[PDB]
Amino acid sequence: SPNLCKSGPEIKQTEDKKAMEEFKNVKIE
Amino acid sequence: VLTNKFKKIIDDFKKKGHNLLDTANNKFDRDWVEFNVEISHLDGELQNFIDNNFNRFRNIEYSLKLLHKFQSTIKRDSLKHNLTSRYNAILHNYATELDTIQRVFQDQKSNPPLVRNMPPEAGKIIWARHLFQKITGPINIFPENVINSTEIRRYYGSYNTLGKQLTIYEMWFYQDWVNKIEQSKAALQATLIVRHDENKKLYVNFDLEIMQLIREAKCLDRQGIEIPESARIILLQEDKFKTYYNELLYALKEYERINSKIKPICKNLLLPHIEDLDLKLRPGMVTL
Amino acid sequence: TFISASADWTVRIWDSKYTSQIICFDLSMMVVDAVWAPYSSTVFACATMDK
């Protein structure tokens, strides 16, 4: 159970995280 | 945190930059005494990431993906130096992966628990081919970057030995396999496959032939191996045999259901009709 | 966003809006079952060899 959820970064920052993954693509380039 | 260090450097740089007009020496020289050493500490951070070029991964080839990511760095022939030191980590973890591959091959295809629709021989040859392809990637990435030091060539020796051995073992399995079917058919399977008939139930005669040729054609097509004309046609004939046996199965089960409903009463109008429903099969029609 | 994982132990973030994948991530055991976790976190999992 300790690894259940972090409850702050996973929820609404996840779309920002996918944008950040696209940023990591721009970085790959 | 990294850009913080860099910007501290940039800021004390730009603040010491007040000495240009009178002293290009003081300004730029002191700016360099600070910036070069601090950007070389940031190069030590980039060198922690040169180690991370592998550490981002537990695999050589993904470390090589990160090497390919490093393309802006090729201007400076100092990463190449760290690249030269790292070529050894490259080769060594390549060696680790192929030693695992070696202990894999030593446990040949028969030992692992395979669950699929591929005969043992087709699974064996295809697993050997896939191991050969998994080895080929490494043995091809090996040269042209570390040929100069030849450590890679020392390891390529053993790898090429393993490859030749794999070729030989595949050849042995193929000697066991390719003409096995030709012998089976020409001896006991191509001599007028006896169609399925009935005395009390349906008697299958060449179910083994059916399953064999099915698996043969399927795996040969899937692996891209030439199928002989004899194999292809006895396969088509087995398809016919199987469809017809399924239909005759259904028909016999129909007679069975009808009898299952008749016998509870044993009426002497349907029992003689049952007797009339009898037929005879001569040897001439056993090849229809 | 979708994901695709290869026989070469490679995991691939197919963003439907793209033709080039996002994060060409990479790990042994990527042939085998992968999954998105039923949490708000985008947790990934691969599993073979009691591991």
Side-chain angles (χ1 to χ4, degrees), chain B residues 83-113:
Chain B
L83 286 172
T84 311
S85 48
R86 191 270 303 274
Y87 293 153
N88 299 344
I90 282 171
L91 66 87
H92 180 67
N93 311 313
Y94 271 99
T96 304
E97 212 195 352
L98 192 141
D99 296 321
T100 299
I101 293 185
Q102 286 175 347
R103 63 91 180 158
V104 159
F105 171 57
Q106 292 167 359
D107 292 312
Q108 57 262 31
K109 183 70 170 188
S110 72
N111 291 326

PDB file of all heavy atoms in Angstrom, chain B residues 83-113:
ATOM      1  N   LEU B  83      34.295   9.052 -24.905  1.00  0.00           N
ATOM      2  CA  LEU B  83      33.753   7.992 -25.749  1.00  0.00           C
ATOM      3  C   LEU B  83      34.752   6.854 -25.895  1.00  0.00           C
ATOM      4  O   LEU B  83      34.372   5.680 -25.901  1.00  0.00           O
ATOM      5  CB  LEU B  83      33.385   8.537 -27.128  1.00  0.00           C
ATOM      6  CG  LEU B  83      32.141   9.414 -27.266  1.00  0.00           C
ATOM      7  CD1 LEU B  83      32.049  10.023 -28.653  1.00  0.00           C
ATOM      8  CD2 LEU B  83      30.904   8.629 -26.971  1.00  0.00           C
ATOM      9  N   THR B  84      36.040   7.185 -26.016  1.00  0.00           N
ATOM     10  CA  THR B  84      37.052   6.142 -26.156  1.00  0.00           C
ATOM     11  C   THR B  84      37.168   5.321 -24.882  1.00  0.00           C
ATOM     12  O   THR B  84      37.303   4.092 -24.932  1.00  0.00           O
ATOM     13  CB  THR B  84      38.398   6.761 -26.523  1.00  0.00           C
ATOM     14  OG1 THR B  84      38.220   7.677 -27.610  1.00  0.00           O
ATOM     15  CG2 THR B  84      39.382   5.677 -26.935  1.00  0.00           C
ATOM     16  N   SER B  85      37.121   5.984 -23.724  1.00  0.00           N
ATOM     17  CA  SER B  85      37.152   5.256 -22.462  1.00  0.00           C
ATOM     18  C   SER B  85      35.905   4.400 -22.297  1.00  0.00           C
ATOM     19  O   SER B  85      35.962   3.313 -21.708  1.00  0.00           O
ATOM     20  CB  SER B  85      37.285   6.228 -21.292  1.00  0.00           C
ATOM     21  OG  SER B  85      36.358   7.292 -21.411  1.00  0.00           O
ATOM     22  N   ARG B  86      34.769   4.865 -22.816  1.00  0.00           N
ATOM     23  CA  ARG B  86      33.510   4.154 -22.646  1.00  0.00           C
ATOM     24  C   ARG B  86      33.332   3.018 -23.646  1.00  0.00           C
ATOM     25  O   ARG B  86      32.569   2.089 -23.357  1.00  0.00           O
ATOM     26  CB  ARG B  86      32.345   5.146 -22.755  1.00  0.00           C
ATOM     27  CG  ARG B  86      30.982   4.605 -22.332  1.00  0.00           C
ATOM     28  CD  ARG B  86      30.240   3.971 -23.499  1.00  0.00           C
ATOM     29  NE  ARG B  86      30.053   4.895 -24.607  1.00  0.00           N
ATOM     30  CZ  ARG B  86      29.032   5.735 -24.679  1.00  0.00           C
ATOM     31  NH1 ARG B  86      28.131   5.726 -23.722  1.00  0.00           N
ATOM     32  NH2 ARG B  86      28.895   6.561 -25.703  1.00  0.00           N
ATOM     33  N   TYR B  87      34.017   3.064 -24.794  1.00  0.00           N
ATOM     34  CA  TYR B  87      33.962   1.956 -25.746  1.00  0.00           C
ATOM     35  C   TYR B  87      34.226   0.624 -25.060  1.00  0.00           C
ATOM     36  O   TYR B  87      33.725  -0.418 -25.494  1.00  0.00           O
ATOM     37  CB  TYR B  87      34.976   2.173 -26.873  1.00  0.00           C
ATOM     38  CG  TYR B  87      34.684   3.349 -27.786  1.00  0.00           C
ATOM     39  CD1 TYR B  87      35.715   4.004 -28.448  1.00  0.00           C
ATOM     40  CD2 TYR B  87      33.386   3.793 -27.994  1.00  0.00           C
ATOM     41  CE1 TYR B  87      35.462   5.078 -29.282  1.00  0.00           C
ATOM     42  CE2 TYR B  87      33.121   4.867 -28.827  1.00  0.00           C
ATOM     43  CZ  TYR B  87      34.165   5.504 -29.470  1.00  0.00           C
ATOM     44  OH  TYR B  87      33.904   6.572 -30.302  1.00  0.00           O
ATOM     45  N   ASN B  88      34.981   0.647 -23.959  1.00  0.00           N
ATOM     46  CA  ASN B  88      35.265  -0.580 -23.226  1.00  0.00           C
ATOM     47  C   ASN B  88      34.047  -1.047 -22.436  1.00  0.00           C
ATOM     48  O   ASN B  88      33.757  -2.245 -22.379  1.00  0.00           O
ATOM     49  CB  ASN B  88      36.471  -0.365 -22.315  1.00  0.00           C
ATOM     50  CG  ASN B  88      37.723  -0.015 -23.096  1.00  0.00           C
ATOM     51  OD1 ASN B  88      37.783  -0.207 -24.310  1.00  0.00           O
ATOM     52  ND2 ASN B  88      38.724   0.513 -22.405  1.00  0.00           N
ATOM     53  N   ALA B  89      33.317  -0.119 -21.813  1.00  0.00           N
ATOM     54  CA  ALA B  89      32.050  -0.495 -21.190  1.00  0.00           C
ATOM     55  C   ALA B  89      31.070  -1.016 -22.229  1.00  0.00           C
ATOM     56  O   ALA B  89      30.349  -1.994 -21.982  1.00  0.00           O
ATOM     57  CB  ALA B  89      31.452   0.697 -20.443  1.00  0.00           C
ATOM     58  N   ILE B  90      31.044  -0.367 -23.396  1.00  0.00           N
ATOM     59  CA  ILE B  90      30.281  -0.865 -24.535  1.00  0.00           C
ATOM     60  C   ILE B  90      30.598  -2.336 -24.771  1.00  0.00           C
ATOM     61  O   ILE B  90      29.728  -3.207 -24.628  1.00  0.00           O
ATOM     62  CB  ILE B  90      30.585  -0.015 -25.786  1.00  0.00           C
ATOM     63  CG1 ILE B  90      29.834   1.314 -25.743  1.00  0.00           C
ATOM     64  CG2 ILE B  90      30.258  -0.765 -27.066  1.00  0.00           C
ATOM     65  CD1 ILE B  90      30.262   2.286 -26.826  1.00  0.00           C
ATOM     66  N   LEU B  91      31.866  -2.634 -25.067  1.00  0.00           N
ATOM     67  CA  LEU B  91      32.246  -3.993 -25.435  1.00  0.00           C
ATOM     68  C   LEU B  91      31.969  -4.969 -24.299  1.00  0.00           C
ATOM     69  O   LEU B  91      31.553  -6.109 -24.534  1.00  0.00           O
ATOM     70  CB  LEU B  91      33.723  -4.042 -25.851  1.00  0.00           C
ATOM     71  CG  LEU B  91      34.859  -3.766 -24.861  1.00  0.00           C
ATOM     72  CD1 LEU B  91      35.279  -5.017 -24.099  1.00  0.00           C
ATOM     73  CD2 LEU B  91      36.054  -3.169 -25.591  1.00  0.00           C
ATOM     74  N   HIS B  92      32.167  -4.534 -23.053  1.00  0.00           N
ATOM     75  CA  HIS B  92      32.063  -5.465 -21.937  1.00  0.00           C
ATOM     76  C   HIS B  92      30.619  -5.853 -21.669  1.00  0.00           C
ATOM     77  O   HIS B  92      30.316  -7.023 -21.419  1.00  0.00           O
ATOM     78  CB  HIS B  92      32.688  -4.875 -20.681  1.00  0.00           C
ATOM     79  CG  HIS B  92      32.604  -5.791 -19.503  1.00  0.00           C
ATOM     80  ND1 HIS B  92      33.295  -6.981 -19.439  1.00  0.00           N
ATOM     81  CD2 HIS B  92      31.882  -5.713 -18.358  1.00  0.00           C
ATOM     82  CE1 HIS B  92      33.020  -7.589 -18.299  1.00  0.00           C
ATOM     83  NE2 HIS B  92      32.165  -6.839 -17.625  1.00  0.00           N
ATOM     84  N   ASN B  93      29.706  -4.884 -21.690  1.00  0.00           N
ATOM     85  CA  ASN B  93      28.314  -5.255 -21.470  1.00  0.00           C
ATOM     86  C   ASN B  93      27.732  -5.962 -22.691  1.00  0.00           C
ATOM     87  O   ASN B  93      26.837  -6.807 -22.545  1.00  0.00           O
ATOM     88  CB  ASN B  93      27.505  -4.025 -21.073  1.00  0.00           C
ATOM     89  CG  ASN B  93      28.169  -3.238 -19.965  1.00  0.00           C
ATOM     90  OD1 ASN B  93      28.601  -3.807 -18.963  1.00  0.00           O
ATOM     91  ND2 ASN B  93      28.273  -1.930 -20.146  1.00  0.00           N
ATOM     92  N   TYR B  94      28.255  -5.671 -23.890  1.00  0.00           N
ATOM     93  CA  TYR B  94      27.960  -6.512 -25.046  1.00  0.00           C
ATOM     94  C   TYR B  94      28.359  -7.959 -24.774  1.00  0.00           C
ATOM     95  O   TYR B  94      27.605  -8.899 -25.067  1.00  0.00           O
ATOM     96  CB  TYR B  94      28.689  -5.980 -26.287  1.00  0.00           C
ATOM     97  CG  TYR B  94      27.939  -4.948 -27.125  1.00  0.00           C
ATOM     98  CD1 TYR B  94      28.196  -3.595 -26.981  1.00  0.00           C
ATOM     99  CD2 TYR B  94      27.004  -5.330 -28.084  1.00  0.00           C
ATOM    100  CE1 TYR B  94      27.534  -2.649 -27.735  1.00  0.00           C
ATOM    101  CE2 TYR B  94      26.340  -4.385 -28.850  1.00  0.00           C
ATOM    102  CZ  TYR B  94      26.611  -3.047 -28.668  1.00  0.00           C
ATOM    103  OH  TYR B  94      25.960  -2.091 -29.416  1.00  0.00           O
ATOM    104  N   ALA B  95      29.549  -8.147 -24.199  1.00  0.00           N
ATOM    105  CA  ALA B  95      30.032  -9.483 -23.876  1.00  0.00           C
ATOM    106  C   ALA B  95      29.152 -10.148 -22.828  1.00  0.00           C
ATOM    107  O   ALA B  95      28.882 -11.350 -22.906  1.00  0.00           O
ATOM    108  CB  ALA B  95      31.482  -9.414 -23.400  1.00  0.00           C
ATOM    109  N   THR B  96      28.714  -9.383 -21.832  1.00  0.00           N
ATOM    110  CA  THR B  96      27.808  -9.923 -20.821  1.00  0.00           C
ATOM    111  C   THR B  96      26.521 -10.433 -21.461  1.00  0.00           C
ATOM    112  O   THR B  96      26.074 -11.560 -21.179  1.00  0.00           O
ATOM    113  CB  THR B  96      27.491  -8.850 -19.776  1.00  0.00           C
ATOM    114  OG1 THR B  96      28.710  -8.363 -19.203  1.00  0.00           O
ATOM    115  CG2 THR B  96      26.611  -9.424 -18.675  1.00  0.00           C
ATOM    116  N   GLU B  97      25.913  -9.617 -22.327  1.00  0.00           N
ATOM    117  CA  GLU B  97      24.673 -10.031 -22.969  1.00  0.00           C
ATOM    118  C   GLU B  97      24.879 -11.281 -23.815  1.00  0.00           C
ATOM    119  O   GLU B  97      24.042 -12.191 -23.802  1.00  0.00           O
ATOM    120  CB  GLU B  97      24.095  -8.901 -23.818  1.00  0.00           C
ATOM    121  CG  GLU B  97      22.570  -8.920 -23.869  1.00  0.00           C
ATOM    122  CD  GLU B  97      21.996  -8.049 -24.970  1.00  0.00           C
ATOM    123  OE1 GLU B  97      22.769  -7.311 -25.610  1.00  0.00           O
ATOM    124  OE2 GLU B  97      20.769  -8.105 -25.195  1.00  0.00           O
ATOM    125  N   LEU B  98      25.993 -11.365 -24.543  1.00  0.00           N
ATOM    126  CA  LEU B  98      26.164 -12.570 -25.347  1.00  0.00           C
ATOM    127  C   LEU B  98      26.575 -13.787 -24.524  1.00  0.00           C
ATOM    128  O   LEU B  98      26.294 -14.909 -24.938  1.00  0.00           O
ATOM    129  CB  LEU B  98      27.160 -12.354 -26.492  1.00  0.00           C
ATOM    130  CG  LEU B  98      27.100 -13.519 -27.498  1.00  0.00           C
ATOM    131  CD1 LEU B  98      27.228 -13.040 -28.911  1.00  0.00           C
ATOM    132  CD2 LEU B  98      28.176 -14.565 -27.243  1.00  0.00           C
ATOM    133  N   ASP B  99      27.202 -13.609 -23.360  1.00  0.00           N
ATOM    134  CA  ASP B  99      27.419 -14.766 -22.496  1.00  0.00           C
ATOM    135  C   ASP B  99      26.098 -15.303 -21.964  1.00  0.00           C
ATOM    136  O   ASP B  99      25.915 -16.526 -21.851  1.00  0.00           O
ATOM    137  CB  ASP B  99      28.353 -14.397 -21.346  1.00  0.00           C
ATOM    138  CG  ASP B  99      29.739 -14.016 -21.825  1.00  0.00           C
ATOM    139  OD1 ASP B  99      30.237 -14.663 -22.770  1.00  0.00           O
ATOM    140  OD2 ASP B  99      30.326 -13.073 -21.258  1.00  0.00           O
ATOM    141  N   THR B 100      25.165 -14.402 -21.647  1.00  0.00           N
ATOM    142  CA  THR B 100      23.805 -14.841 -21.357  1.00  0.00           C
ATOM    143  C   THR B 100      23.195 -15.562 -22.559  1.00  0.00           C
ATOM    144  O   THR B 100      22.522 -16.591 -22.406  1.00  0.00           O
ATOM    145  CB  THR B 100      22.949 -13.646 -20.944  1.00  0.00           C
ATOM    146  OG1 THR B 100      23.492 -13.062 -19.752  1.00  0.00           O
ATOM    147  CG2 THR B 100      21.519 -14.076 -20.678  1.00  0.00           C
ATOM    148  N   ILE B 101      23.432 -15.046 -23.767  1.00  0.00           N
ATOM    149  CA  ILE B 101      22.946 -15.713 -24.977  1.00  0.00           C
ATOM    150  C   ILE B 101      23.555 -17.106 -25.107  1.00  0.00           C
ATOM    151  O   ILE B 101      22.909 -18.048 -25.583  1.00  0.00           O
ATOM    152  CB  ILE B 101      23.245 -14.849 -26.216  1.00  0.00           C
ATOM    153  CG1 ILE B 101      22.420 -13.562 -26.194  1.00  0.00           C
ATOM    154  CG2 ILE B 101      22.963 -15.624 -27.489  1.00  0.00           C
ATOM    155  CD1 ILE B 101      22.571 -12.720 -27.447  1.00  0.00           C
ATOM    156  N   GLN B 102      24.809 -17.253 -24.688  1.00  0.00           N
ATOM    157  CA  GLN B 102      25.492 -18.540 -24.787  1.00  0.00           C
ATOM    158  C   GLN B 102      24.882 -19.551 -23.833  1.00  0.00           C
ATOM    159  O   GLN B 102      24.618 -20.696 -24.212  1.00  0.00           O
ATOM    160  CB  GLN B 102      26.982 -18.368 -24.501  1.00  0.00           C
ATOM    161  CG  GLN B 102      27.771 -17.719 -25.618  1.00  0.00           C
ATOM    162  CD  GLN B 102      29.213 -17.469 -25.224  1.00  0.00           C
ATOM    163  OE1 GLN B 102      29.570 -17.558 -24.048  1.00  0.00           O
ATOM    164  NE2 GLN B 102      30.051 -17.158 -26.204  1.00  0.00           N
ATOM    165  N   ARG B 103      24.660 -19.149 -22.579  1.00  0.00           N
ATOM    166  CA  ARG B 103      23.990 -20.060 -21.658  1.00  0.00           C
ATOM    167  C   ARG B 103      22.559 -20.337 -22.104  1.00  0.00           C
ATOM    168  O   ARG B 103      21.995 -21.384 -21.769  1.00  0.00           O
ATOM    169  CB  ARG B 103      24.029 -19.520 -20.224  1.00  0.00           C
ATOM    170  CG  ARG B 103      23.304 -18.210 -19.984  1.00  0.00           C
ATOM    171  CD  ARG B 103      21.856 -18.435 -19.571  1.00  0.00           C
ATOM    172  NE  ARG B 103      21.150 -17.182 -19.331  1.00  0.00           N
ATOM    173  CZ  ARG B 103      19.826 -17.056 -19.379  1.00  0.00           C
ATOM    174  NH1 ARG B 103      19.071 -18.106 -19.666  1.00  0.00           N
ATOM    175  NH2 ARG B 103      19.260 -15.880 -19.143  1.00  0.00           N
ATOM    176  N   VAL B 104      21.961 -19.417 -22.866  1.00  0.00           N
ATOM    177  CA  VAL B 104      20.650 -19.680 -23.460  1.00  0.00           C
ATOM    178  C   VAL B 104      20.752 -20.794 -24.494  1.00  0.00           C
ATOM    179  O   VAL B 104      19.988 -21.764 -24.465  1.00  0.00           O
ATOM    180  CB  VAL B 104      20.073 -18.391 -24.078  1.00  0.00           C
ATOM    181  CG1 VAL B 104      19.016 -18.725 -25.123  1.00  0.00           C
ATOM    182  CG2 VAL B 104      19.489 -17.501 -22.995  1.00  0.00           C
ATOM    183  N   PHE B 105      21.696 -20.664 -25.429  1.00  0.00           N
ATOM    184  CA  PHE B 105      21.836 -21.668 -26.482  1.00  0.00           C
ATOM    185  C   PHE B 105      22.226 -23.023 -25.906  1.00  0.00           C
ATOM    186  O   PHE B 105      21.803 -24.065 -26.419  1.00  0.00           O
ATOM    187  CB  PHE B 105      22.868 -21.220 -27.518  1.00  0.00           C
ATOM    188  CG  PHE B 105      23.227 -22.293 -28.511  1.00  0.00           C
ATOM    189  CD1 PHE B 105      22.248 -22.895 -29.287  1.00  0.00           C
ATOM    190  CD2 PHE B 105      24.542 -22.707 -28.662  1.00  0.00           C
ATOM    191  CE1 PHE B 105      22.572 -23.888 -30.195  1.00  0.00           C
ATOM    192  CE2 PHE B 105      24.872 -23.696 -29.573  1.00  0.00           C
ATOM    193  CZ  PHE B 105      23.886 -24.285 -30.340  1.00  0.00           C
ATOM    194  N   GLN B 106      23.030 -23.029 -24.839  1.00  0.00           N
ATOM    195  CA  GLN B 106      23.398 -24.287 -24.198  1.00  0.00           C
ATOM    196  C   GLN B 106      22.168 -25.008 -23.663  1.00  0.00           C
ATOM    197  O   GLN B 106      22.142 -26.242 -23.597  1.00  0.00           O
ATOM    198  CB  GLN B 106      24.408 -24.027 -23.083  1.00  0.00           C
ATOM    199  CG  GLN B 106      25.760 -23.561 -23.591  1.00  0.00           C
ATOM    200  CD  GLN B 106      26.636 -23.012 -22.486  1.00  0.00           C
ATOM    201  OE1 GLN B 106      26.235 -22.964 -21.325  1.00  0.00           O
ATOM    202  NE2 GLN B 106      27.843 -22.588 -22.847  1.00  0.00           N
ATOM    203  N   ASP B 107      21.142 -24.254 -23.271  1.00  0.00           N
ATOM    204  CA  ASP B 107      19.828 -24.822 -22.981  1.00  0.00           C
ATOM    205  C   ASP B 107      19.016 -24.762 -24.270  1.00  0.00           C
ATOM    206  O   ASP B 107      18.222 -23.849 -24.509  1.00  0.00           O
ATOM    207  CB  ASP B 107      19.154 -24.075 -21.840  1.00  0.00           C
ATOM    208  CG  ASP B 107      19.848 -24.291 -20.512  1.00  0.00           C
ATOM    209  OD1 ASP B 107      20.137 -25.459 -20.176  1.00  0.00           O
ATOM    210  OD2 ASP B 107      20.112 -23.296 -19.808  1.00  0.00           O
ATOM    211  N   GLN B 108      19.227 -25.769 -25.117  1.00  0.00           N
ATOM    212  CA  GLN B 108      18.652 -25.777 -26.452  1.00  0.00           C
ATOM    213  C   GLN B 108      17.126 -25.776 -26.389  1.00  0.00           C
ATOM    214  O   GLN B 108      16.521 -25.936 -25.328  1.00  0.00           O
ATOM    215  CB  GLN B 108      19.152 -26.986 -27.242  1.00  0.00           C
ATOM    216  CG  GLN B 108      18.858 -28.320 -26.580  1.00  0.00           C
ATOM    217  CD  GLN B 108      20.045 -28.857 -25.807  1.00  0.00           C
ATOM    218  OE1 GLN B 108      20.855 -28.094 -25.283  1.00  0.00           O
ATOM    219  NE2 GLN B 108      20.155 -30.179 -25.734  1.00  0.00           N
ATOM    220  N   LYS B 109      16.512 -25.614 -27.563  1.00  0.00           N
ATOM    221  CA  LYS B 109      15.076 -25.348 -27.652  1.00  0.00           C
ATOM    222  C   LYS B 109      14.239 -26.387 -26.919  1.00  0.00           C
ATOM    223  O   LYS B 109      13.143 -26.073 -26.438  1.00  0.00           O
ATOM    224  CB  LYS B 109      14.654 -25.277 -29.119  1.00  0.00           C
ATOM    225  CG  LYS B 109      13.195 -24.935 -29.329  1.00  0.00           C
ATOM    226  CD  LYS B 109      12.919 -23.499 -28.938  1.00  0.00           C
ATOM    227  CE  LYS B 109      11.529 -23.078 -29.370  1.00  0.00           C
ATOM    228  NZ  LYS B 109      11.310 -21.626 -29.156  1.00  0.00           N
ATOM    229  N   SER B 110      14.727 -27.625 -26.820  1.00  0.00           N
ATOM    230  CA  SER B 110      13.943 -28.683 -26.193  1.00  0.00           C
ATOM    231  C   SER B 110      13.768 -28.479 -24.695  1.00  0.00           C
ATOM    232  O   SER B 110      12.802 -28.996 -24.122  1.00  0.00           O
ATOM    233  CB  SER B 110      14.596 -30.041 -26.457  1.00  0.00           C
ATOM    234  OG  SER B 110      15.791 -30.182 -25.712  1.00  0.00           O
ATOM    235  N   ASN B 111      14.665 -27.739 -24.049  1.00  0.00           N
ATOM    236  CA  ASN B 111      14.643 -27.589 -22.599  1.00  0.00           C
ATOM    237  C   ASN B 111      13.588 -26.600 -22.095  1.00  0.00           C
ATOM    238  O   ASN B 111      12.916 -26.899 -21.100  1.00  0.00           O
ATOM    239  CB  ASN B 111      16.036 -27.188 -22.095  1.00  0.00           C
ATOM    240  CG  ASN B 111      17.047 -28.313 -22.232  1.00  0.00           C
ATOM    241  OD1 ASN B 111      16.709 -29.488 -22.089  1.00  0.00           O
ATOM    242  ND2 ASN B 111      18.295 -27.956 -22.510  1.00  0.00           N
ATOM    243  N   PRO B 112      13.402 -25.429 -22.711  1.00  0.00           N
ATOM    244  CA  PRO B 112      12.400 -24.480 -22.199  1.00  0.00           C
ATOM    245  C   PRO B 112      10.982 -24.960 -22.463  1.00  0.00           C
ATOM    246  O   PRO B 112      10.748 -25.786 -23.358  1.00  0.00           O
ATOM    247  CB  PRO B 112      12.704 -23.192 -22.980  1.00  0.00           C
ATOM    248  CG  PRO B 112      13.378 -23.654 -24.207  1.00  0.00           C
ATOM    249  CD  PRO B 112      14.228 -24.794 -23.756  1.00  0.00           C
ATOM    250  N   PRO B 113      10.001 -24.464 -21.686  1.00  0.00           N
ATOM    251  CA  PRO B 113       8.569 -24.825 -21.839  1.00  0.00           C
ATOM    252  C   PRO B 113       7.829 -24.007 -22.897  1.00  0.00           C
ATOM    253  O   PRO B 113       7.209 -22.971 -22.623  1.00  0.00           O
ATOM    254  CB  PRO B 113       8.022 -24.583 -20.429  1.00  0.00           C
ATOM    255  CG  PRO B 113       8.853 -23.459 -19.901  1.00  0.00           C
ATOM    256  CD  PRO B 113      10.224 -23.587 -20.520  1.00  0.00           C
TER     257      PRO B 113
END
